Amino acid sequence: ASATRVIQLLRNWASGRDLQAKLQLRYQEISKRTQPPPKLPVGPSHKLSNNYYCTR
């Protein structure tokens, strides 16, 4: 956060905890908004043999 050391110390004392560690606002730890393309797997019935529907 863009908070000065005096303000950070006052905030931590008033709260009683280290707020600068577990900040609620998200800055950079979020995942990227442009993720690589995926490749999802097929299910257990995507086989060319021994897969008659009467058995499942």
In angstroms, how far is CA 28 from the centroid of its own chain? 12
Residue 6 touching other proteins (CB under 8 A) = yes
Applying the rule CB under 8 A, the residues between 25 and 44 that interact with other proteins are 25-44
In angstroms, how far is CA 32 from the centroid of its own chain? 10
Residue 16 touching other proteins (CB under 8 A) = yes
Per-residue tokens: 49? 């043999």
**Alpha helices, DSSP H only, in 1-56?**
5-15
CB of 1 to other proteins, least distance (A): 6
Residue ranges that bind other proteins, judged by CB under 8 A: 1-7, 10-17, 19, 22-46
